[PDB]
PDB file of C-alpha atoms in Angstrom:
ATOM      1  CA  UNK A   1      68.383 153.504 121.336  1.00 25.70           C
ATOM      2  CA  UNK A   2      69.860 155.917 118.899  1.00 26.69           C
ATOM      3  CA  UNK A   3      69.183 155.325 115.097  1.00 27.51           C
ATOM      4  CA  UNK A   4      73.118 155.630 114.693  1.00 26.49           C
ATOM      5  CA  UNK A   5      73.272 152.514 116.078  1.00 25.31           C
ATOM      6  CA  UNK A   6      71.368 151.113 113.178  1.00 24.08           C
ATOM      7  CA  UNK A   7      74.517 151.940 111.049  1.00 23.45           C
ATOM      8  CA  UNK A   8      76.508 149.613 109.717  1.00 24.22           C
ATOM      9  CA  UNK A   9      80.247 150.140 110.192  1.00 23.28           C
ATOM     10  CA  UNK A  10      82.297 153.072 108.783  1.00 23.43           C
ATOM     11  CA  UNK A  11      86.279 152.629 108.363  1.00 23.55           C
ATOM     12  CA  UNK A  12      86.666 156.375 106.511  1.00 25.47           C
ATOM     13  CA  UNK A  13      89.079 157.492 104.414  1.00 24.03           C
ATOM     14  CA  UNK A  14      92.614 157.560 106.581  1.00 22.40           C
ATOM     15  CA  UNK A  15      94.590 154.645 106.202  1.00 20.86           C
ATOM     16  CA  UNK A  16      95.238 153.602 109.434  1.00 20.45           C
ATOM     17  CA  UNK A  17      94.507 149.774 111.244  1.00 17.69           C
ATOM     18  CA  UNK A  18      92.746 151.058 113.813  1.00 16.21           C
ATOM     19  CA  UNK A  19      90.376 148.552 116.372  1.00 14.30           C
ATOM     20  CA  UNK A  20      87.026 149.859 117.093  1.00 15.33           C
ATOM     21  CA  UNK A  21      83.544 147.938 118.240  1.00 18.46           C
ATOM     22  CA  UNK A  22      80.091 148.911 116.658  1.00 21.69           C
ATOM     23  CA  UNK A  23      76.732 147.605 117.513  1.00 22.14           C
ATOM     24  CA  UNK A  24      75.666 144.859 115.100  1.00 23.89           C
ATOM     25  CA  UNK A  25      71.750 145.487 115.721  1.00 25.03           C
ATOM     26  CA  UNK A  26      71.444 141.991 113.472  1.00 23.51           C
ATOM     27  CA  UNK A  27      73.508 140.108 115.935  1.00 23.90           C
ATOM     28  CA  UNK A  28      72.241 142.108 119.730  1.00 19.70           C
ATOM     29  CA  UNK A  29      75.894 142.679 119.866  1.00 19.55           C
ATOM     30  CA  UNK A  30      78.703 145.103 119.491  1.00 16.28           C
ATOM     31  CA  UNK A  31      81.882 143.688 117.484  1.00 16.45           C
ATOM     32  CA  UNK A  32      85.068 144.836 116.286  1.00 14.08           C
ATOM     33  CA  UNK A  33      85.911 146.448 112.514  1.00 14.15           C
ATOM     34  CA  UNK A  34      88.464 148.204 111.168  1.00 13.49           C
ATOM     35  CA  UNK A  35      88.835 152.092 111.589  1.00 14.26           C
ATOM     36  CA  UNK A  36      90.756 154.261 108.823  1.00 13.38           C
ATOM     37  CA  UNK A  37      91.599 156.592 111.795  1.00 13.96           C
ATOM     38  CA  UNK A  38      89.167 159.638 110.413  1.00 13.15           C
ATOM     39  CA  UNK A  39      86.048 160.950 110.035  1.00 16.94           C
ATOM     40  CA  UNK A  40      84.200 158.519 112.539  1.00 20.13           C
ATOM     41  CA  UNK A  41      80.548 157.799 112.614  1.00 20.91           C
ATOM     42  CA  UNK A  42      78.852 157.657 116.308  1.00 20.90           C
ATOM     43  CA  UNK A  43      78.587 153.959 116.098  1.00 18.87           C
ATOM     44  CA  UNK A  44      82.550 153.673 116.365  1.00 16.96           C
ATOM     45  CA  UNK A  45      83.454 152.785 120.213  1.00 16.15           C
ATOM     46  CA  UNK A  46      86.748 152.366 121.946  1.00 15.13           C
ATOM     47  CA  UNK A  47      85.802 150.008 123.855  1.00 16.38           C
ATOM     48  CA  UNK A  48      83.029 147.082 123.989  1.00 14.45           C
ATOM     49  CA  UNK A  49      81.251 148.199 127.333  1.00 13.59           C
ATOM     50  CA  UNK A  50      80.922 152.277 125.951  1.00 14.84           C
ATOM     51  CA  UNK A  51      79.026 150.323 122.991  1.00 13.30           C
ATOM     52  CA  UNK A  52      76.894 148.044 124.776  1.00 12.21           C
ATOM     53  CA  UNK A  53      75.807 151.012 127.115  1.00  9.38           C
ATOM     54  CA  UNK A  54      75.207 153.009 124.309  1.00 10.51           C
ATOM     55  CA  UNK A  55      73.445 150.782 121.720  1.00 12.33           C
ATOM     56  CA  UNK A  56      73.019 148.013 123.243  1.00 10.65           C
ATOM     57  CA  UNK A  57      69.662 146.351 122.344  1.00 10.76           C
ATOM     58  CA  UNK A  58      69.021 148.905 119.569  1.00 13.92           C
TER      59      UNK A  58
ATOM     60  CA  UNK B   1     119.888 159.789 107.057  1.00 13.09           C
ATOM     61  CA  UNK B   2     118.757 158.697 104.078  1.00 15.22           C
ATOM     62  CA  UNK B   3     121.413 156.117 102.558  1.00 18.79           C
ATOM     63  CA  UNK B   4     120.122 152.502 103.576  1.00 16.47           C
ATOM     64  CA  UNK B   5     122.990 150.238 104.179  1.00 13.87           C
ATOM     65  CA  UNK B   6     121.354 146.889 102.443  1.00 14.96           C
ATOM     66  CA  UNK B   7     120.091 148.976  99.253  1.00 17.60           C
ATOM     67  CA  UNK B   8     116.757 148.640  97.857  1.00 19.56           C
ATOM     68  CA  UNK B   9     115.597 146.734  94.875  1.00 16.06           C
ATOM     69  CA  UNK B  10     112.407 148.350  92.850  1.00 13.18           C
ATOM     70  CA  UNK B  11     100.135 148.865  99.670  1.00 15.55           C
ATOM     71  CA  UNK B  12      97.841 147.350  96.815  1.00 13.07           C
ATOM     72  CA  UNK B  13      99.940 146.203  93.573  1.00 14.50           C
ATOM     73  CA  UNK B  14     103.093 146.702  95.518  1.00 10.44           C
ATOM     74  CA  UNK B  15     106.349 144.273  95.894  1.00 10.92           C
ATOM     75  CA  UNK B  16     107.683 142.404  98.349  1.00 10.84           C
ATOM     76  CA  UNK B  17     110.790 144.747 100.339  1.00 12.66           C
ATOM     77  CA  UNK B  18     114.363 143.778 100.099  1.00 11.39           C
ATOM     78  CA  UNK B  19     114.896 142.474 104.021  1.00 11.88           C
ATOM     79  CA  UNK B  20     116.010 145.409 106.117  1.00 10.67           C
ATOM     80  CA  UNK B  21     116.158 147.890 102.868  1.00 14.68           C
ATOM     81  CA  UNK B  22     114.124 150.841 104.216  1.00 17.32           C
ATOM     82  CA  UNK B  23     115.726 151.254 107.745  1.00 14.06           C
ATOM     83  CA  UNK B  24     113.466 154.263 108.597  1.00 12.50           C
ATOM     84  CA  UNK B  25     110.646 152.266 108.492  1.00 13.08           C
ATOM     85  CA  UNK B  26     108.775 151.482 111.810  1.00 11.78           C
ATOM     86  CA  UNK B  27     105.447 149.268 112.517  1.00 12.78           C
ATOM     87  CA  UNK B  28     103.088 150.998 115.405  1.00 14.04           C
ATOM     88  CA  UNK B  29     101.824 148.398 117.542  1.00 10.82           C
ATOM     89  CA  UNK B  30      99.609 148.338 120.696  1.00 13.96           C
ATOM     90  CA  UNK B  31     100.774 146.718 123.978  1.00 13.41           C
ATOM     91  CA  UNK B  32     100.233 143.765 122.325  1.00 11.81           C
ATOM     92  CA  UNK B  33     101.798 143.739 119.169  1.00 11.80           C
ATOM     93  CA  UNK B  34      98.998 144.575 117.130  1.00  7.66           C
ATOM     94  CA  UNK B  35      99.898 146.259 114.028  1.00  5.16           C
ATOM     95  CA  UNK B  36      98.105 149.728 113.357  1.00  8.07           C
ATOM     96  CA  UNK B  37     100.305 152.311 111.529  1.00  8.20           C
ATOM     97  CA  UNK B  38     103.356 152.480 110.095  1.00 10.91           C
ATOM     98  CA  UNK B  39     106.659 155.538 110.924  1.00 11.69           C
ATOM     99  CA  UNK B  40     109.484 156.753 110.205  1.00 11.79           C
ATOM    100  CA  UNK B  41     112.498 157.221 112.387  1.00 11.20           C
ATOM    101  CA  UNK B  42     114.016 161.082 111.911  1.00 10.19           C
ATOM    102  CA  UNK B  43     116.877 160.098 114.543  1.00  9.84           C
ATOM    103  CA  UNK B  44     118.016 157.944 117.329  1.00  8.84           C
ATOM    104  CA  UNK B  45     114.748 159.656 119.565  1.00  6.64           C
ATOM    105  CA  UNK B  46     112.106 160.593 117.614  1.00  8.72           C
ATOM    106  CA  UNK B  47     109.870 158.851 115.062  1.00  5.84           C
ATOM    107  CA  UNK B  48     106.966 160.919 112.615  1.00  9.55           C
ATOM    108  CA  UNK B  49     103.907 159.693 111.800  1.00 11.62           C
ATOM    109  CA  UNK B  50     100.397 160.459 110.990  1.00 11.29           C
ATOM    110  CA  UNK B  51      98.084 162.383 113.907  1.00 12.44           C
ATOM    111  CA  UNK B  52      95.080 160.408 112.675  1.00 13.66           C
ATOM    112  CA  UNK B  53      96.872 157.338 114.045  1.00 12.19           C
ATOM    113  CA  UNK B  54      96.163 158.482 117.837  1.00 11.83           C
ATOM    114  CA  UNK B  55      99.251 156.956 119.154  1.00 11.60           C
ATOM    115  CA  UNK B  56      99.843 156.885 122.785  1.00 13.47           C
ATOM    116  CA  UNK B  57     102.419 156.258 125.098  1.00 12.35           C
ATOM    117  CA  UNK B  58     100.595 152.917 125.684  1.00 12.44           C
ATOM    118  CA  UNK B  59     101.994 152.025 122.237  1.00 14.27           C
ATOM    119  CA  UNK B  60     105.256 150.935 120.959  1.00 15.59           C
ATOM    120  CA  UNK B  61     107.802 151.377 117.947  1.00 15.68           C
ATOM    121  CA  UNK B  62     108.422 148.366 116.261  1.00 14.61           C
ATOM    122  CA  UNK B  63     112.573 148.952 114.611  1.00 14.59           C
ATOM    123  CA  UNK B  64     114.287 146.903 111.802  1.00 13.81           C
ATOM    124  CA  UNK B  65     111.110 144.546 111.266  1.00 12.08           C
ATOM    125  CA  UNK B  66     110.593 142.708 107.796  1.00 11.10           C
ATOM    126  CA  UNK B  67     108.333 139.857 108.328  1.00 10.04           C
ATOM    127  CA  UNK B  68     105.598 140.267 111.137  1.00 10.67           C
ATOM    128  CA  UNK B  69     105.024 136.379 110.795  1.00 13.17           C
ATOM    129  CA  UNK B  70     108.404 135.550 111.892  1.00 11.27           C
ATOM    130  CA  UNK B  71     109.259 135.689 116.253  1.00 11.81           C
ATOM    131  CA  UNK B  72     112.907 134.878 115.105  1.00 10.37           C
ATOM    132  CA  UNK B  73     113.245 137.763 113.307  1.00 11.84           C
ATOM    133  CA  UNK B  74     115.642 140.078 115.806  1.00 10.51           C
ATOM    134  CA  UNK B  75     114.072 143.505 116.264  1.00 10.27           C
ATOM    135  CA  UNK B  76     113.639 146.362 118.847  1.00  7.09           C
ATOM    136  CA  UNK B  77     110.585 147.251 120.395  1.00  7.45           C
ATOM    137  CA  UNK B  78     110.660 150.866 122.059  1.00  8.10           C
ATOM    138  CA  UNK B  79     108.476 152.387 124.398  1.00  7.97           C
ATOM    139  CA  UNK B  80     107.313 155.596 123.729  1.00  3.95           C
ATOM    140  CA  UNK B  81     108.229 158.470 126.241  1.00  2.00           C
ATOM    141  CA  UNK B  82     105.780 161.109 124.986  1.00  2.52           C
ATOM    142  CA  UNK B  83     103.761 161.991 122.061  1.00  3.44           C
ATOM    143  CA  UNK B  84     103.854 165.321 119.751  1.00  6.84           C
ATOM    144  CA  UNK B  85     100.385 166.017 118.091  1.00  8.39           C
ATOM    145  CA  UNK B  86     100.486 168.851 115.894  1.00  5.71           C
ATOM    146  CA  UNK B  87      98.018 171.422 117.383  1.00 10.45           C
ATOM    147  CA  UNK B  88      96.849 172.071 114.029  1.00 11.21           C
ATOM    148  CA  UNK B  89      95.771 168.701 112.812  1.00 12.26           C
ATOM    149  CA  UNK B  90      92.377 169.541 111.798  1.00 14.54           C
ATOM    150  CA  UNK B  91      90.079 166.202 112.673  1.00 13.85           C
ATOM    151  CA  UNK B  92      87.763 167.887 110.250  1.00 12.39           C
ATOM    152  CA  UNK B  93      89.894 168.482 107.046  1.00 13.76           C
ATOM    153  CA  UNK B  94      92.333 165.910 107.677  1.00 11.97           C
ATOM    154  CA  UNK B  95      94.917 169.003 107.295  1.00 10.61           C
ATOM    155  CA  UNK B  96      98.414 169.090 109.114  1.00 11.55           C
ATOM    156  CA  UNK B  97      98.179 165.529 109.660  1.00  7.11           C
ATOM    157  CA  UNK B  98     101.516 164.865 111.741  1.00  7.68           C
ATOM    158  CA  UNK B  99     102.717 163.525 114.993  1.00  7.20           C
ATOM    159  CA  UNK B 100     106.344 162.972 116.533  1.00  8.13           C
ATOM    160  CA  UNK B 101     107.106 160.217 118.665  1.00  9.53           C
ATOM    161  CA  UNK B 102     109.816 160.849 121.322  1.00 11.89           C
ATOM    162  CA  UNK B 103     111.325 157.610 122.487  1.00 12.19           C
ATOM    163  CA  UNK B 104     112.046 156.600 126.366  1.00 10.47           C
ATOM    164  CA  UNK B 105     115.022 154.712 125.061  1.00  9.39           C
ATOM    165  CA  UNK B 106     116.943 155.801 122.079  1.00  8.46           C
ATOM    166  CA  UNK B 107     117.071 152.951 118.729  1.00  4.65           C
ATOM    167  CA  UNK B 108     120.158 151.322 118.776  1.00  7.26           C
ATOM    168  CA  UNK B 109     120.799 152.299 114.991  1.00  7.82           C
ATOM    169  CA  UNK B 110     122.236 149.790 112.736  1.00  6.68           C
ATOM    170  CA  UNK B 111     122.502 148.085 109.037  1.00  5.43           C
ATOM    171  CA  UNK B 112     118.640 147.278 109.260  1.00  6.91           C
ATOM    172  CA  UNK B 113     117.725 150.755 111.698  1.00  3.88           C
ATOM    173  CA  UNK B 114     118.571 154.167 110.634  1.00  2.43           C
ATOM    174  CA  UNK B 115     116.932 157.600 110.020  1.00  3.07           C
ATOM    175  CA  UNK B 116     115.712 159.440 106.756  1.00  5.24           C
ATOM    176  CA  UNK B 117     116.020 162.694 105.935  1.00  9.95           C
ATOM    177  CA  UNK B 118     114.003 165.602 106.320  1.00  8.89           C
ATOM    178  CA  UNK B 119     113.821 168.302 103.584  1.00  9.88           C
ATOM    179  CA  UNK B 120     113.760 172.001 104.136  1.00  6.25           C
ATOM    180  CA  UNK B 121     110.782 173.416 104.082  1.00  4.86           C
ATOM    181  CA  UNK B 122     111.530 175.294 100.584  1.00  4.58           C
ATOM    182  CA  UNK B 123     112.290 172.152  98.665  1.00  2.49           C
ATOM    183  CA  UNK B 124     110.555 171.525  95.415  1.00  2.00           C
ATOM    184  CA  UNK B 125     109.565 167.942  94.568  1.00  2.00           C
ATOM    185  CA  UNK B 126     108.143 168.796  91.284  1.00  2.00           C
ATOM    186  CA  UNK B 127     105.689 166.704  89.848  1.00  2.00           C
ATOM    187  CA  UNK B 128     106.182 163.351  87.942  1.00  2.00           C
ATOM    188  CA  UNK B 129     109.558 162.776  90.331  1.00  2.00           C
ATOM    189  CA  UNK B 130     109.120 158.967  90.917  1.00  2.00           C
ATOM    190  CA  UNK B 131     108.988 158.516  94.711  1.00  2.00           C
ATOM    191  CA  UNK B 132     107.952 154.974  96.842  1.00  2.00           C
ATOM    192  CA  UNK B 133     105.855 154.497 100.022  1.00  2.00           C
ATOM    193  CA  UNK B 134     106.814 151.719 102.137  1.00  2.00           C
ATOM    194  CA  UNK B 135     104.406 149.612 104.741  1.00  2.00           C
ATOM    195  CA  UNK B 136     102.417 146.614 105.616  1.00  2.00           C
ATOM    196  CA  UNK B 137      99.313 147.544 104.933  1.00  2.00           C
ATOM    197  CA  UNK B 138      96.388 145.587 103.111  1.00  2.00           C
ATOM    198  CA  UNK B 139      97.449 144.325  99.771  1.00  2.21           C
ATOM    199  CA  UNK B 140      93.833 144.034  98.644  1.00  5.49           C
ATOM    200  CA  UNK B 141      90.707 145.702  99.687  1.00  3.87           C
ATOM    201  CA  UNK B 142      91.571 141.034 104.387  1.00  2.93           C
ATOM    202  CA  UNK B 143      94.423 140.440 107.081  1.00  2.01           C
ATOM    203  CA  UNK B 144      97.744 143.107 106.545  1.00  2.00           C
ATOM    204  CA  UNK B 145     100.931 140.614 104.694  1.00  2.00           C
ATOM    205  CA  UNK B 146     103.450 139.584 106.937  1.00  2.00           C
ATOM    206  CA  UNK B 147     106.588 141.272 104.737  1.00  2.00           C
ATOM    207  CA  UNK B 148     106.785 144.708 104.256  1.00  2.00           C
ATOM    208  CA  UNK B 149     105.949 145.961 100.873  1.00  2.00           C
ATOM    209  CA  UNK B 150     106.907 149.008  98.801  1.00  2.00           C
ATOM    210  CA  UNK B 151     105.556 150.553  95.624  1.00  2.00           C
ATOM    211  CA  UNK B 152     107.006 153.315  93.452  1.00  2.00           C
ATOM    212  CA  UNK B 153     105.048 156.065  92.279  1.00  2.55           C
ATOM    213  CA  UNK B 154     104.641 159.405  91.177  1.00  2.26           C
ATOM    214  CA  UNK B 155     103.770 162.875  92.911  1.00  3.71           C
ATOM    215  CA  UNK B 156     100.844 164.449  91.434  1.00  3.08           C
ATOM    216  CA  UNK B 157     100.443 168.211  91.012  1.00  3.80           C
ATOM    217  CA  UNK B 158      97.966 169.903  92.807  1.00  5.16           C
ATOM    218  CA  UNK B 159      95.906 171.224  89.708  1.00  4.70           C
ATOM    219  CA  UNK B 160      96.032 167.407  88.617  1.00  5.41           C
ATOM    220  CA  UNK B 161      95.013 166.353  92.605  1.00  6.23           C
ATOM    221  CA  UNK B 162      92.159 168.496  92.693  1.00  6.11           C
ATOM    222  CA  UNK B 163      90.558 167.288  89.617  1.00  7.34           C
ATOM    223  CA  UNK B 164      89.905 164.146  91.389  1.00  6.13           C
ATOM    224  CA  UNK B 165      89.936 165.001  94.872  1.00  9.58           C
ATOM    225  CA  UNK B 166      88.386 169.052  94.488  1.00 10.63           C
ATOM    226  CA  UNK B 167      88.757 171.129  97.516  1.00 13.47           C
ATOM    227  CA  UNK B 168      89.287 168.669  99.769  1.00 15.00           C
ATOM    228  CA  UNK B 169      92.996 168.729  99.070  1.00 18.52           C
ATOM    229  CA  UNK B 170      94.392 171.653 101.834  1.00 19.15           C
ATOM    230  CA  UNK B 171      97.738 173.269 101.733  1.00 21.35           C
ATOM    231  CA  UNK B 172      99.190 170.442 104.323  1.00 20.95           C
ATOM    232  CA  UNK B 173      98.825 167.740 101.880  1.00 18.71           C
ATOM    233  CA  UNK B 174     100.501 166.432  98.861  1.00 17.14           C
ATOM    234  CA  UNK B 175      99.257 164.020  96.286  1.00 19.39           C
ATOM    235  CA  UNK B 176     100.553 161.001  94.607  1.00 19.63           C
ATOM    236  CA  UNK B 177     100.155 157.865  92.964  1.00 23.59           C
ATOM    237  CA  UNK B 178      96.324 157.127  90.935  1.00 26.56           C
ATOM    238  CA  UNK B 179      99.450 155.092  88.530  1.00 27.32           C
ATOM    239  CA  UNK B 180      98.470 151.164  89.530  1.00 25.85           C
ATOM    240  CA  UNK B 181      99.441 151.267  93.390  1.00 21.98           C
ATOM    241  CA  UNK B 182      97.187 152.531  96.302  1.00 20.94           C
ATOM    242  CA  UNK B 183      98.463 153.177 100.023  1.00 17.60           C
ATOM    243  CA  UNK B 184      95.480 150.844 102.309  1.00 17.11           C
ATOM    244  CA  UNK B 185      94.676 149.906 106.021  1.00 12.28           C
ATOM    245  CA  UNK B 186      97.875 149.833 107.969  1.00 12.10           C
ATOM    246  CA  UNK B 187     100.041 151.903 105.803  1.00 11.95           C
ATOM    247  CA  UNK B 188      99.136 154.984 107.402  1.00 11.14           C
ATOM    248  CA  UNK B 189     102.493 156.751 109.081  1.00 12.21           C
ATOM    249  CA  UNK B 190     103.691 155.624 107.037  1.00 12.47           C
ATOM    250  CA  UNK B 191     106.806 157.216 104.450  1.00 14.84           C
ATOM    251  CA  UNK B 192     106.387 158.648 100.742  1.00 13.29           C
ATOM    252  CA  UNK B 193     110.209 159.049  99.839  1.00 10.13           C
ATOM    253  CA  UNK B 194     112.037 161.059  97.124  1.00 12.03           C
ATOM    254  CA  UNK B 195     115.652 161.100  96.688  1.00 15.90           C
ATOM    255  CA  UNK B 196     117.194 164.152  96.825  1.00 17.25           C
ATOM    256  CA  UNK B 197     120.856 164.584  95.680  1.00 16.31           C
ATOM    257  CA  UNK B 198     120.719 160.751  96.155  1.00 15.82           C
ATOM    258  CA  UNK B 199     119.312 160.436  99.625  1.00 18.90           C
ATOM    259  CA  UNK B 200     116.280 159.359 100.645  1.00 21.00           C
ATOM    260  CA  UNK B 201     113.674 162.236 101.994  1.00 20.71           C
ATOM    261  CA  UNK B 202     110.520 161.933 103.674  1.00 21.44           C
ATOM    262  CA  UNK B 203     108.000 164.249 101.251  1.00 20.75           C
ATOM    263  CA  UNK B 204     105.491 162.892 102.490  1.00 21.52           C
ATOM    264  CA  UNK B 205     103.035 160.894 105.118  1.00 23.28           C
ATOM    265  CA  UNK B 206     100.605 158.539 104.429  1.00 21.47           C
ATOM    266  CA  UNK B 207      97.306 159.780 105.354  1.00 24.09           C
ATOM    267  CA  UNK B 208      94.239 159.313 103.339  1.00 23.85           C
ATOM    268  CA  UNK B 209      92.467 158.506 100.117  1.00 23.21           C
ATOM    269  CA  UNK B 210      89.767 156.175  98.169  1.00 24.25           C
ATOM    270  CA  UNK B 211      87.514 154.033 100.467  1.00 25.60           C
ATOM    271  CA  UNK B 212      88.275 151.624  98.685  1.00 24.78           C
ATOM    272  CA  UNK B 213      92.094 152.036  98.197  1.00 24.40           C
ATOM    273  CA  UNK B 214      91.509 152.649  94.397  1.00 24.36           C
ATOM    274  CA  UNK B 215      94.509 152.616  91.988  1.00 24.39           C
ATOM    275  CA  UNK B 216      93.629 154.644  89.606  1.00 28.21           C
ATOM    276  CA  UNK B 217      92.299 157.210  92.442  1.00 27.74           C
ATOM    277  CA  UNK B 218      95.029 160.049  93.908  1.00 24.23           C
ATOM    278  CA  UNK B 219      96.779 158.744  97.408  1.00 28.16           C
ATOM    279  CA  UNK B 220      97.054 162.135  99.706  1.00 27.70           C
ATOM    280  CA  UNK B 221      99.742 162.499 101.986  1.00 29.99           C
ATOM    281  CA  UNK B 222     100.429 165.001 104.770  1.00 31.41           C
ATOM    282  CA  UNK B 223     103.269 167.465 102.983  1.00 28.69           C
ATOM    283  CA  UNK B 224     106.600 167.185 104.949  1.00 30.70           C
ATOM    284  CA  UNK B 225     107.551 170.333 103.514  1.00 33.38           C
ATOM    285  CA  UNK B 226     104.565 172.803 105.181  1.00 34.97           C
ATOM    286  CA  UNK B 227     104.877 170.777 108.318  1.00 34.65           C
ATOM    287  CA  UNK B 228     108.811 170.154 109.035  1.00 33.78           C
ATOM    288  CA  UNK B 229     109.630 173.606 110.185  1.00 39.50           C
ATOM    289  CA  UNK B 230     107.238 171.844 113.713  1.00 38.94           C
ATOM    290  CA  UNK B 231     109.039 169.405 113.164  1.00 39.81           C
ATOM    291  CA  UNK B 232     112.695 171.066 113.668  1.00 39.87           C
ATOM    292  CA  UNK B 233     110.638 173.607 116.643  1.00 39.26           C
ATOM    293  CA  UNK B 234     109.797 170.435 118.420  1.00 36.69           C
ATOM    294  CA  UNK B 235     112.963 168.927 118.793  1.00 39.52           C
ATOM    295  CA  UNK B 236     114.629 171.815 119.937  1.00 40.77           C
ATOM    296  CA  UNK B 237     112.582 172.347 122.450  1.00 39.06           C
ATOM    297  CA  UNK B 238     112.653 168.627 123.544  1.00 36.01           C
TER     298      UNK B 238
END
């Protein structure tokens, strides 16, 4: 899997309440966080399947 | 616009809102009432926000809500008809960071729901003018408080922005704030108001700032000014 998967969540500088998932490589599974609406990092997922078929098992 | 019928009384370090005080003042929500940026109402049809909110007609605007906790509490939700990204909003830069939402069903306006002004686009808000931003966003760097909260503050000057915040700061944007208060998760959308020959103008957006929603750190906001002349070209034309 991609090493940005290894990375732990990134909210970014907007201000905005935003649900995203990101894989938790600690865990074997993607959960939700808080995005700042900006400025995303590639482990930042709309929805939980996109993560788990993107990361999943990383 | 701009002249709140119940009058106002004066976000991290921010107060608890007078019930109903800032009319304008809209909460974002998904389908299922999830709160995730804030708005302002312009008129009966249309409410401005930020474009890094994403808002889609899947969403809906929350009107004339105080406390989130409360399913007593009489509001209106609208749908949203269609949404108005500024073409310019730069994903990169965070520059021209604006949206307009057109409502399905007009707001049924009231002593609780109303509109705020816009300014012109050559009106000078010099800095040091005291100004407040409204929302329900985090009060500390965490779930967002159920009553909306409000914190006055001042605008910064762009010299004194940049010190801070370098060249990061664009010509869409407009500081303010770094006095005890910070804008944080869920304020976004949000309004920065100013009065201006006693009513109430939007100046500015909330849009970014610290990571970790600093007070001593410069809020940026998109300015209303450089943008609201897209504003007035997309109503007209819709």
């Amino acid at each position: 899997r991609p090493d940005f998967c290894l990375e732990p969540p990134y909210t970014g500088p907007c201000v905005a309440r935003i649900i995203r998932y990101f894989y938790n490589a600690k865990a074997g599974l993607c959960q939700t966080f808080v995005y700042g609406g900006c400025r995303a990092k590639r482990n930042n997922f709309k929805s939980a399947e996109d993560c788990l078929r993107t990361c999943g098992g990383a | 616009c701009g002249v709140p019928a119940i009058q106002p009384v004066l976000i991290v370090n921010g107060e608890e809102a007078v019930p109903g005080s800032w009319p304008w003042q809209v909460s974002l929500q998904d389908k299922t009432g999830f709160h995730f940026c804030g708005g302002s109402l312009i008129n009966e049809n249309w409410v401005v926000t930020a474009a890094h909110c994403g808002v889609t007609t899947s969403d809906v605007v929350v009107a004339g809500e105080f406390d989130q906790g409360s399913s007593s509490e009489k509001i209106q939700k609208l749908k949203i008809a269609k949404v108005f990204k500024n073409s310019k909003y730069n994903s990169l830069t965070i520059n021209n960071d604006i949206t307009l939402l057109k409502l399905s069903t007009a707001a049924s306006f009231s002593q609780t729901v109303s509109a705020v002004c816009l300014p012109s686009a050559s009106d000078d808000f010099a800095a040091g003018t005291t100004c407040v931003t409204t929302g329900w966003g985090l009060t500390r760097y965490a779930n967002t408080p159920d009553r909306l909260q409000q914190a006055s503050l001042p605008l910064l000057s762009n010299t004194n922005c940049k010190k801070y915040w370098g060249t990061k700061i664009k010509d869409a944007m407009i500081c303010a704030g770094a006095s005890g208060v910070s804008s944080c998760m869920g304020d976004s959308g949000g309004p920065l108001v100013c009065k201006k020959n006693g009513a109430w103008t939007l100046v500015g957006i909330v849009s970014w700032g610290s990571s970790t929603c600093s007070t001593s750190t410069p809020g940026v906001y998109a300015r209303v000014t450089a943008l609201v002349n897209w504003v007035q070209q997309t109503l007209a034309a819709n």
